[PDB]
Design a protein around this ligand. Structure first.
Ligand code: ADP
Ligand code: ADP
Ligand code: MG
Lengths: 336, 230
């Protein structure tokens, strides 16, 4: 069986084909980052326009890449939410109508379930149950996962998500948007320990997060200190180490609370190299296992959508002829 | 030939099929419902006419201008359909479609189309039908402030009919123009009226592959401000 997957939730157009015998047969990705960088944020109208420019051509490239033709596709899955309405609509209209013309099932996919399941795309995927740390641009959640569509929320951010926190602090350090990855690279240049940021909400028990106070601390530190390259590297490092310790501490507590032996990380922040290393080290001391996708499947991509599409198809989640999108769509509300 | 037309650029959703000498069409107001109605309409038309998507010679789509979201719905759906069944595509102006509507409803041959574009503008065109039924005036399409429309109308002459939601929002639009204006009786484009235009285009080879189908937004200044310095 093979599923075409379509991802247009924000500012990446992603198309992939996933075959359950042979694996990933195609993965096409266009990122709009240069279009939005000039603005310091994603401009929805422009994002929507550029999805139109890219979706159909990247579908054609996917089929050619894989050497398949229409008849070899069993279903078409597309991100229905959460995300920007305008963007989501482009991939959903193309996908649902393509499915109609090919006369195959159309599978609407929850963008964060895509992220959650991206580790399943690697060798040695996690078995249920596990704790999932979803850590993206606008999400930061701890989830107890007992099976497909059995997601119990355990902790979440009450303000900024970890990704936003990275991007917001990167902007203060003069980097282009989104600056999280660049902040991470600068950080490798930093003197460990020269500055020390709080680990918010780590002094009382509990699983929720807050990161807003961390920007504040960054900005004050950028104010009371020199603007040379090193001093900025050192601030980037301190910011990064603190976020990573916070995520780690909280993952520990959820592993404690659940008694689970498996930690799965996903979302764009799970590309962060320090984070990956620290959670792997932690799971080794606990004698459990950590899981994550390759770095390019942590951030938005089509592969995860084709995979999650396949899973939802097999779970019976097929759409009628209507097309709908859900810009806000809590993960806990998905059925099992 | 068989030609399937789809439109969602405005408050209306419509689908229509030119089926070798008869038309089978649907039209309704779908505010908030375009994406729930559009494929069921397509399905119903194909089934009731006993045609399938791969019997179609071309897919005509409402290219714009109009609702940015609407226009994208239209071309999204039209693109998956065309990609899926390997159909060539024919983009049709929503302004020109309303002109054709007026010709259909009351024999109008010179049309001033104005769509309410919001932000105190309208999408504008001057369409005139020759003795062969071809609509001239595509070069006049534009997004304009009413006072600029007014200036433009003073450079025109003769009798015109008015179509589109632009005239409802701004009913004094032709004040002191010097033209005789009559009500064209068309507020919205209908897929049914894209058909004669698309059939003509098909006969002449004015089609494009799905990867070259584009919306016409007319308003392209749509960002907020850039950061200091770029
Ligand atoms: N190596 C990294 N370190 C920290 N943050 C990263 C890294 N790579 C990507 N990010 C952040 O991940 C976020 C993008 O997450 P992603 O899941 O791709 O998008 P979305 O939030 O749109 O689902 C951005 O906040 C980005 O800055
Ligand atoms: N979130 C959505 N989901 C499905 N369809 C939508 C959505 N948003 C807009 N549309 C469709 O596009 C049409 C145009 O949207 P818009 O230009 O914002 O005008 P309005 O909201 O005033 O109707 C809507 O009437 C609706 O049918
Ligand atoms: Mg993105």
């Amino acid at each position: 069986m093979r599923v075409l997957g379509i991802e247009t939730s924000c500012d990446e157009t992603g198309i992939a084909i996933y075959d359950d015998e042979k694996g990933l047969l195609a993965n096409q990705l266009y990122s709009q980052v240069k279009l939005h960088a000039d603005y310091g944020g994603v401009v929805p109208e422009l994002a929507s326009r550029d999805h139109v420019r890219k979706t159909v051509p990247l579908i054609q490239a996917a089929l050619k890449e894989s050497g398949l033709t229409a008849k070899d596709i069993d279903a078409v899955a597309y991100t229905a939410g959460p995300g920007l309405v305008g963007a989501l609509l482009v991939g959903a209209t193309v996908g649902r109508s393509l499915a109609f013309a090919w006369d195959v099932p159309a599978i609407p996919v929850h963008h964060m379930e895509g992220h959650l399941l991206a580790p399943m795309l690697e060798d040695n995927p996690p078995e249920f149950p596990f704790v999932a740390l979803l850590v993206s641009g606008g999400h930061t959640q701890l989830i107890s996962v007992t099976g497909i569509g059995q997601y119990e929320l355990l902790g979440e951010s009450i303000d900024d998500a970890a990704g936003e926190a990275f991007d917001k602090t990167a902007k203060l350090l003069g980097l282009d948007y989104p600056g999280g990855p660049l902040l991470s690279k600068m950080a490798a240049q930093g003197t460990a320990g020269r500055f020390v940021f709080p680990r918010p909400m780590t002094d009382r028990p509990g699983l929720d997060f807050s990161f807003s106070g961390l920007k504040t601390f960054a900005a004050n530190t950028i104010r009371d200190n020199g603007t040379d390259d090193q001093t900025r590297a050192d601030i980037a490092r301190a910011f990064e180490d603190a976020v990573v310790d916070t995520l780690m501490i909280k993952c520990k507590r959820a592993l404690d609370q659940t008694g689970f032996k498996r930690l799965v990380m996903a979302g764009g922040v799970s590309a962060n190299r320090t984070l990956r290393a620290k959670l792997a080290e932690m799971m080794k001391k606990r004698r459990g296992e950590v899981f994550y996708a390759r770095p390019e499947f942590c951030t938005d991509n089509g592969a995860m959508i084709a995979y999650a599409g396949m899973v939802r198809f097999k779970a019976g989640a097929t759409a009628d002829l209507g097309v709908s999108v859900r810009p806000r769509w809590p993960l806990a509300e998905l059925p099992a | 030939m068989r030609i399937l037309a789809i439109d969602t650029a405005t408050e209306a959703c419509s689908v229509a099929l030119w089926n070798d000498g008869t038309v089978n069409a649907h039209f309704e107001l779908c505010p908030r419902e375009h994406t729930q109605r559009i494929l069921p309409m397509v399905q119903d038309i194909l089934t009731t006419s006993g045609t399938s998507l791969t019997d179609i010679n071309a897919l005509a789509y409402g290219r714009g201008p109009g609702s940015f979201t609407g226009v994208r719905i239209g071309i999204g759906i039209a693109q998956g359909l065309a990609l899926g069944a390997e159909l060539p595509m024919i983009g049709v102006s929503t302004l020109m479609t309303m002109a054709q509507g007026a010709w259909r409803k009351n024999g109008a041959t010179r049309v001033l189309a104005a769509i309410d574009a919001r932000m105190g503008e309208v999408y504008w065109a001057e369409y005139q039908r020759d003795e062969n039924g071809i609509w001239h005036g595509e070069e006049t399409e534009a997004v304009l402030k009413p006072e600029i429309v007014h200036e433009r109308m003073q450079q025109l002459s003769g009798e015109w009919v008015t179509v589109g939601t632009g005239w409802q929002a701004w009913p004094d639009l032709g004040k002191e123009s010097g033209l005789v204006l009559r009500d064209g009786e068309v507020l919205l484009p209908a897929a049914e009226d894209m058909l004669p235009i698309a059939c003509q285009m098909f006969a002449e080879g004015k089609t494009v592959a799905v990867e070259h189908a584009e919306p016409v937004y007319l308003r392209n200044n749509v960002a907020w401000k850039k950061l200091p310095g770029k």
